[PDB]
């Protein structure tokens, strides 16, 4: 008999991608080897992010990437994102960038290639920089999904700006009792 608790004995993190495609699994093999036979933690972070799910790999926009690479000090370094690089149409001037991503939108790829940059895939990234020196690791906005507007402190409760679940927006849908001081109460 030992006075211990087994509730949190097992950790929940992912050991391998839930996906079944073969290209991602080959990438996982390569980066598993790199992470376990290299002291650099960039490989560990990249492999962990390869394991993650789709909603945990949000797309990164061209405007975000250029904005985060225009910061001082990080010139002529390769921007690495484990998600999808999507094009942003509300930006005219695009510089030359050295991008690496699993997949890139067709229009975004056309824009970068026209601007003069080059697109890399995580394989060739391994060949170029195994330990990943000169890399700027970016990611898309994880809280960008609209489901996060429904989360948190419940609506109809003071100081809670949480979106309710309504089938249609209008004046006849959840506007009368809990939303007005004129009818009952106002939270």
Decide: 153 and 162 in contact? Cβ < 8 Å: yes
- Identify the residue among 95, 96, 124, 152 touching RNA (CB under 7 A): 152
Q: How far is 91 from 4, CA to CA, in rounded Å?
A: 58
Decide: 47 and 130 in contact? Cβ < 8 Å: no
- The residues in 161-180 that bind other proteins, with binding defined as CB under 8 A, are 164-166, 171-172, 174-180
53 binds, among RNA, other proteins, none (CB under 5 to 8 A by kind): RNA
For other proteins, give the closer residue by CB, 75 or 106.
106
96 binds RNA (CB under 7 A): no
Closest C-alpha among 26, 19, 17 to residue 50: 17
Q: Residue 123 CB, nearest distance to RNA (Å)?
A: 11
**Residues, the chain:** 187
Q: Residue 89 CB, nearest distance to other proteins (Å)?
A: 5
Torsion of CA 117, 122, 124, 127, to 10 degrees: 120
Q: How would you class 52 by CB atoms within 10 Å of its CB: exposed for 0-12, middle for 13-18, buried for 19 or more?
A: middle
For other proteins, give the closer residue by CB, 9 or 146.
146
Tokens standing for residue 21: 């495609």
- The residues in 130-159 that bind other proteins, with binding defined as CB under 8 A, are 130-131, 154-157
Q: What is the largest CA-CA distance in the chain?
A: 70
For other proteins, give the closer residue by CB, 74 or 173.
173
* Binding residues for other proteins (CB under 8 A): 19-27, 29-30, 33-34, 37-39, 89-90, 92, 102-104, 106, 109, 121-124, 126-127, 130-131, 154-157, 164-166, 171-172, 174-180, 183-184, 187
């Amino acid at each position: 008999g030992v006075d211990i608790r087994h509730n949190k004995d097992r950790k929940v993190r992912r050991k391998e991608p839930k996906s079944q495609d073969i290209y991602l699994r080959l990438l996982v093999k390569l980066y598993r080897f790199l992470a376990r036979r290299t002291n650099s933690t960039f490989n560990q972070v990249v492999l962990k992010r390869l394991f993650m799910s789709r909603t945990n790999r949000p797309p990164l926009s061209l405007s975000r990437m250029i904005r985060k690479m225009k910061l001082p000090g990080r010139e002529n370094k390769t921007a690495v994102v484990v998600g999808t690089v999507t094009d942003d149409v509300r930006v005219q001037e695009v510089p030359k960038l050295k991008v690496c991503a699993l997949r890139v939108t067709s229009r975004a790829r056309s824009r970068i290639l026209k601007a003069g940059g080059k697109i890399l895939t995580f394989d060739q990234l391994a060949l170029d920089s195994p330990k990943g020196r000169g890399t700027v690791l970016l990611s898309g906005p994880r809280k960008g999904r609209e489901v996060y507007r429904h989360f948190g402190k419940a609506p109809g409760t003071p100081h809670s700006h949480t979106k309710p679940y309504v089938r249609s927006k209008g004046r006849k849908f959840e506007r009368a009792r809990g939303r007005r001081a004129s009818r009952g109460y106002k939270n």
